[model samples]
Target chain A: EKRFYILTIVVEDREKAYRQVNELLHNFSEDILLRVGYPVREENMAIIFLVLKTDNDTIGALSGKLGQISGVRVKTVPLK
Target chain B: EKRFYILTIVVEDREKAYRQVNELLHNFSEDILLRVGYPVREENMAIIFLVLKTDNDTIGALSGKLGQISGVRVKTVPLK
Candidate 1:
């Protein structure tokens, strides 16, 4: 089984999205796993994908916290 | 959000690494960013990093494509 997985999140604005991702990364461990982001549809919407060595609960809490931000949405999918 | 970041890959062969990256970029588009194996590590494998605009589905599909190549490995991290 794989120890790491990827997740996708959508947000309303790219500028705000960038700031939010940086904030979350600050809260994560210092190991600096991996993070990449890009525009999905247009300037107003963007998607971020993350890979990390964590379980469902950790990711779930992170997702919940991210959702609390305005115009943010998230989804997780485990890699096979 | 942030536009791109690096992904580390370990493949069984360097020559095959070049071929696989070419195939992947061809399947996607010319805009995908790739580079020669880096760091000069002593391990018996090749490492190549890419910077691209990607989301879960995009990166997942791309990873699957890379995995199909024999002796290739892939990992990604998304930036907020």
Candidate 2:
């Protein structure tokens, strides 16, 4: 069973963390219903927002994995 | 110069409001750096989240247009 959730990722150093985040996102692509990624050139950072349709476990796994990367921060929330 | 902003749309009635939202999103596609749309089937609603890099006027126009739809509510906030 699937429910809707929101995942927001902040990449502090684009060069150091973006690729890792992209790869993780690719691995979990099917669980993601939609994703948006763009950079803030002035600050040399990026923001990625996703709409995911998956279970709680998957959300944990993905967010946890994303959290482990250096310069990357993740926040996950349910669409209440 | 373009700055980043976050836009959230809640579609109350999928059949009645989604296409309209999608169409408007398409028209402003370039301004949107990223977007995610997914349904909450249990609640018969949908949530769309977007990361946009654009001017304040365009943000105003887009958010204004989106708010005009009957079953669609729009919230736009700058990523400060």
Scored by CA lDDT, what does every candidate get? 0.61, 0.82
* Structural similarity to truth (TM-score) of each candidate: 0.43, 0.52
Across B15-62, the per-residue lDDT of candidate 1 in tens digits comes to 666567656754653234543333223565555666666556777777
Sequence-dependent TM-score of model 1: 0.43
Q: What lDDT does candidate 2 reach at residue A49?
A: 82
> In candidate 2, what are the lDDT values of residues B1-80, reduced to their tens digit?
78899999999855558668867886886677666666565676778888898988999999999999999988999997
- CAPRI grade, predicted model 1: incorrect
Please provide TM-scores computed only on chain A for all of the candidate models, following their numbering: 0.71, 0.92
10 residues in a row with least lDDT, candidate 2 chain A: A13-22
Q: Tell me, what's the RMSD of every candidate?
A: 12.8, 8.0
Candidate 2 wrong stretches, greater than 4 Å: A1-80
CAPRI quality level assigned to candidate 2 from its DockQ score: acceptable
lDDT of 1 at A1: 22
lDDT of 1 at B18: 51
